[PDB]
C-alpha cells in the first residue's frame, strides 16, 4: 500500500502541467442574473435531503419520459423490473452507462446524507457517526455497484483501500 500510494504520487507529480490562461469563470453569477433562481440560507441536512429527493425526481422523470411502466426505482436508488421482459421492451430499456453512473452517485450521496439524518435524530453518537462516514468512503465499491459502470474507477477504490491500511 505504501508503494502504490507513492506510485500514484510520483505519477501526479510527473504529469503536472500548468493550466491554460483563460477568462475567469463564474457559473452562479450567471445563474443569479437569471430571474428564475432565488437565494436563501438553509441548514446543511435540509438541503442534503432536498438534493436527494430532487435526484430521485429527476431519475423518475427520465424513466417516465419514454413511457416506461415496467420499471421501478426505489427511494434508496435501486432499479428493478416488475415482470419478466420481452425482446422489444429490452430494446426500449437501453440507457447509457451514464444513467446508472449518476444513479450510483445519487445512491452514495443519499447514504452520506442519511448517515447525518440518523445522527441528528439522536439515534447514534458522533463517535459512531465518525466511524460510519469512514466506512462509506472506504467501501464505496462494496456498498455500491458503481465499479461495474466505470472500469477506471478501480483506481479510485484501491487508493481508498490503501489509505484504509496505513491509518
Amino acid at each position: 500500500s505504501y508503494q502504490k500510494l507513492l506510485k500514484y504520487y510520483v505519477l501526479n507529480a510527473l504529469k503536472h502541467r500548468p493550466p491554460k490562461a483563460q477568462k475567469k469563470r463564474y457559473l452562479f453569477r450567471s445563474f443569479k442574473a437569471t430571474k428564475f433562481f432565488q437565494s436563501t440560507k438553509l441548514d446543511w441536512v435540509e438541503v442534503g435531503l432536498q438534493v436527494c429527493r430532487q435526484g430521485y425526481n429527476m431519475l423518475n422523470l427520465l424513466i417516465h419520459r419514454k413511457n416506461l411502466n415496467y420499471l421501478h426505482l426505489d427511494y434508496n436508488f435501486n432499479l428493478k423490473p416488475v415482470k419478466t421482459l420481452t425482446t422489444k421492451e429490452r430494446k426500449k430499456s437501453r440507457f447509457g452507462n451514464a444513467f446508472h453512473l449518476c444513479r450510483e452517485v445519487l445512491r452514495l450521496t443519499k447514504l452520506v446524507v442519511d448517515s447525518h439524518v440518523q445522527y441528528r435524530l439522536g439515534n447514534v453518537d458522533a463517535f459512531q457517526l465518525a466511524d460510519g462516514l469512514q466506512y462509506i468512503f472506504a467501501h464505496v465499491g462494496q456498498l455500491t455497484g458503481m465499479y461495474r459502470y466505470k472500469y477506471k474507477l478501480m483506481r479510485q477504490i484501491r487508493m481508498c483501500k490503501d489509505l484504509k491500511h496505513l491509518i
Partner: protein, 207 residues
Amino acid sequence: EDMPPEHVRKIIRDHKRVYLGALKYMPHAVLKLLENMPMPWEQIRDVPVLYHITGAISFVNEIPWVIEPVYISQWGSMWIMMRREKRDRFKRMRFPPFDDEEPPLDYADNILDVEPLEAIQLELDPEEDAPVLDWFYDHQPLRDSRKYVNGSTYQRWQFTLPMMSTLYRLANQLLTDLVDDNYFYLFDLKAFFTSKALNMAIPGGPK
C-alpha cells in the same frame, strides 16, 4: 438579497420548457453538496442555497475555506479524542437505514425542533490554551475580527507567535519530528524520477 427559509420549504414540500433545462446541472449540485460536509466537531452548519422557482434544483454555493494550521490542529485534536474514545469504549451503524419503499424524511416535522446531541471536542485547559480558547471550534473562526482576517470573504490570515506555538503543540500527532532534508535521501521526487527513467526499483520505492 436573500429570502426566508419557509418559502423554499413550501416550494420543495408542495411540488415545461423552463423546468426541464434546470435538471442538467444535477451532479454539479451533488459536488457542491459533498464538498461542504460538516466536520466532526460541528453540530450544525448553515449554508446559502440557490433554488429554482418550482424547486427543480438546489445548490450550496460556497467554497469551504479553512486556515491550514488551525485545520491540522483541529484534526489532531479529533485524532487524540478518538484514540481516547476507542481505548475507553462498539456499534457500527446499520447501513441504509431508511427502507426502499419509504420516502426520505421531512426536515420541518422531525429535525426542525429537535435539539442535536453533543459533538466531538477536546477539553482545551484554560491556562495553556488561552490564545486559542475563544475560537477553536467555530465554523469559520475569527471571521468577524479585523485584526486577524481581512474581511468577510475570509481569504488571508495572520496570527501571533503564541497562537502558532499553541496550534503547533496541539497538532503534534499529525506532524513529523524531522528537522532537515538529510532525510528522504534517494527517497524524494527526483530520485523516483531517475528510477523511473532507468527502470530500476528502489528498496521501499514504487515499481
